[PDB]
């Protein structure tokens, strides 16, 4: 599995994600009422979110694009 890592006007970075971890995520991180950072990439397991966060899992190639 390749997953996207970072995306921007430049393009996107992707990782071919290691062994055992055959999801890719987006993962909205509460910070303060008028804050949210985001990050996406590779996982083993999908976890269930903390109140506030978001957590969204796929399983194909750049599927997190």
């Known amino acids: 599995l390749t997953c996207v890592t970072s995306?921007?006007?430049?393009?996107?970075?992707?990782?071919?994600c290691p062994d055992g971890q055959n999801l890719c995520?987006?993962?909205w991180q509460y910070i303060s009422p008028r804050m949210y950072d985001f990050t996406r990439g590779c996982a083993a397991t999908?976890?269930?979110?903390?109140?506030?966060?978001?957590?969204?899992?796929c399983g194909t190639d750049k599927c997190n694009k």
């Open 7 to 16: 995306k921007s006007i430049f393009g996107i970075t992707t990782e071919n």
């Open 25 to 27: 995520f987006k993962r």
């Open 46 to 57: 999908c976890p269930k979110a903390e109140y506030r966060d978001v957590i969204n899992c």
